[PDB]
């Protein structure tokens, strides 16, 4: 069986923003599964589901669908969630959505590994997601940091390096657009442009011809932000290297 909570500790906190997938409607409201915190059952009492009277229940809330929510009453003993949908402020909603997305992404990461090798899920959770969270706040932030520069994976060890490699691969060449508008109208201008390209493309990406004045090259990114540094270099080359030819070039 697959279980275990999204965050570090077992039980939710007061005034925690959650996203709730609707299961079934009863009397109090709905016995929803909180997708920001484990799968513990809770309810939205019929007073705090919407800001205004909307009469219809199965169009603004909907069975099977997700709702932007906040946790009101929590009892750290066994398992009760008194929940609200109304108390979520304007804006804020977007943030909540983002958080939910992040959580989902995190969840997606932690299952492939399990599939590849069974072994207790709690242990896996401990060795992948929690220490980072403790250090900062959320696991997605940690993941982002890792992607930017690999150091968070060095902190707590994965069960195998293969998994890490796979993750890296998943994260990974990324195409970045680079458009060159050369102000040429001469017969031997195209050739010149080509020559210029050949001195800049070498030593490291994919140059596409659209027109005689317009040239569109796609630059590869290995670690996402590595593509910006190559683009910059290319730009520099246009201003510094291409001066001997005397061909006027413009960048979008």
């Amino acid at each position: 069986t697959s279980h275990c909570r999204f965050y570090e500790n077992k039980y939710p906190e007061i005034d925690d923003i959650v996203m709730v997938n609707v299961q079934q409607i009863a009397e109090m409201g709905a016995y929803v599964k909180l997708l920001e915190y484990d799968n513990i059952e809770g309810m939205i009492l019929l007073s705090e589901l919407s800001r205004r009277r909307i009469r219809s229940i199965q169009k603004l809330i909907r069975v099977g669908k997700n709702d932007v929510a906040v946790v009101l009453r929590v009892d750290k003993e066994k398992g009760y969630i008194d929940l609200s949908k109304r108390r979520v402020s304007s804006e804020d909603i977007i943030k909540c959505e983002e958080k939910y997305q992040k959580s989902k992404t995190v969840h997606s990461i932690l299952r492939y590994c399990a599939e590849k090798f069974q072994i207790p899920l709690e242990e896996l959770y401990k060795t992948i997601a929690w220490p980072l969270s403790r250090k900062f706040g959320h696991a997605y932030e940690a993941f982002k940091l890792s992607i930017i520069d690999e150091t968070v994976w060095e902190g707590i060890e994965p069960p195998s390096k293969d998994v890490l490699d796979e993750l890296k691969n998943y994260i990974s060449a990324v195409k970045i657009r680079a458009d060159v508008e050369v102000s040429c109208f001469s017969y031997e201008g195209i050739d010149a442009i080509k020559d210029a390209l050949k001195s800049a493309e070498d030593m490291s990406v994919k140059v596409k011809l659209v027109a005689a004045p317009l040239y569109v090259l796609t630059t590869q990114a290995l670690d996402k932000q590595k593509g910006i540094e190559q683009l910059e270099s290319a730009i520099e080359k246009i201003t510094e290297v291409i001066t001997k030819y005397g061909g006027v070039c413009n960048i979008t």
């Binding site: 001469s186 031997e188 027109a211 005689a212």
Partner: protein
Amino acid sequence: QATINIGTIGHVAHGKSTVVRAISGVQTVRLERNITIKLGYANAKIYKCQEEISPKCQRPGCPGRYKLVRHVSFVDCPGHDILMSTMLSGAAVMDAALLLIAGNESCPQPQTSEHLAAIEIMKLKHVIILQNKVDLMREESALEHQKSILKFIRGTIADGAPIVPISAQLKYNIDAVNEFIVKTIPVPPRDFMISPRLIVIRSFGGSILNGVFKLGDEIEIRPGIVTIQCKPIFSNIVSLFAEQNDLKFAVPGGLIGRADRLVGQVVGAKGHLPNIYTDIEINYFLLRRLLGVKKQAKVRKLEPNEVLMVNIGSTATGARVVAVKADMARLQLTSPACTEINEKIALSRRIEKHWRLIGWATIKK
């Protein structure tokens, strides 16, 4: 590089471009739902079986690698009653032509005539009429058309302008066409010593007429870009190409090499003496009829303060009539004309919304 410039005039969809395809292989790309819209372009090698199209005689009789006579070039015009203004333009590069009539449609069809008389007007006197779509007709029909042709080709300047029926679709009889065009469309001498002068009809392109250009010369374009005035553009011949193959120099007959801006511009020697006129003295004559449309209404004489298309060289300019004498009118132009010599021009009027060829003359300075 190609020796000569052969034009393929004629009415619309008679297959001009298709005949060019049976002769060279080349298409004008197309326009793909319509038809030829820019002047098409294509070249080819003509050799002969002493003992053709490719150095290969073993196609007929036998092997002895056919002897190369010349390499020619074509200019596929369009056929549509309204592309008149370009076809005119195009003629300025021709050294001769081939009139593609359609075997299965009423002989003097609007544009067929419009063209023909344009030809006899500008000077393109080396003509070959061609009866195209005979692959879809009765063996009687194509001969009776040959009659109406042999009868039109009478009073007119067209003595023995032969008429070679073809099938541009199944490429049949083309070799007798190559023999016509190997007899009648002879390759004109051109003194090179003359002032290097050439016409432009594309650019991404144009034809030389007198002189010769070489890699690395200093050159100018006229009238050039505008301000309202019009100044010449200077540059260096970065390169020379005919067809897909590069050459170091370039001589008349052929076309050489954004959207097509300097259309109707000309290229000459940098530091050369050519007038960039705004106002011009035409000597002139009219047709008695308006041969072109699908109605022959009789040509009204020129009234002053009238707008007329003045087709000069490759260029196509619009202008207003300041003077009206017997055969000398003075015209004021929107866009300047660089007058390289003495010259030929072609004069048109917006008859019924669409423009129409009505008369001609000679530029005068």
